[PDB]
């Protein structure tokens, strides 16, 4: 009963950076070190945060509960930039429409599953989706008790 979930609660971008640095993420391969948190943008999803060697930036990938367990969420379009050409802006408009449609359905489904205590295993499906995205599970950063998610769904994600 005293075990701490492996899922972070709400954590800010500054602490995400500093936790990745504490575990030497910037001198390891991308995804060799990562953490799993309650998403601050979409409640009921999870966000996997890691360091991207190729672009020297922290990157995030969202998962959500689906009928078969945790799966990768719809991919958001590339965030706009001051340098964006008309061609990039036009693709953004299309990708964003498609993303918002797909994400709305995905979130609505995830929320309904997240609200129920289902007597079927789901933690293993999170582990499996992490493997599908090639996350070094030995490199999982574990929260302290005060850092960990308070969500009832994650009590046994230990
Ligand atoms: Cl997020």
Residue numbers in the entry: 10 to 167
What does the original paper state about this entry?
To understand the molecular basis underlying the superbinding characteristics of the Legionella SH2 domains, we determined the structures of L. longbeachae LeSH and the L. pneumophila RavO SH2 domain in complex with tyrosine-phosphorylated peptides by X-ray crystallography. Compared to the Src SH2 domain, LeSH is missing two β-strands (βA and βF) but contains a 45-residue insert between the strand βE and the helix αB. This extra sequence in LeSH contains a structural motif called the pancreatic polypeptide (PP)-fold, comprising an amphipathic α-helix (named herein as αEF) packed against a polyproline segment via favorable hydrophobic contacts. Indeed, the SH2 and PP folds together form a clamp-like structure that grasp the pTyr residue.
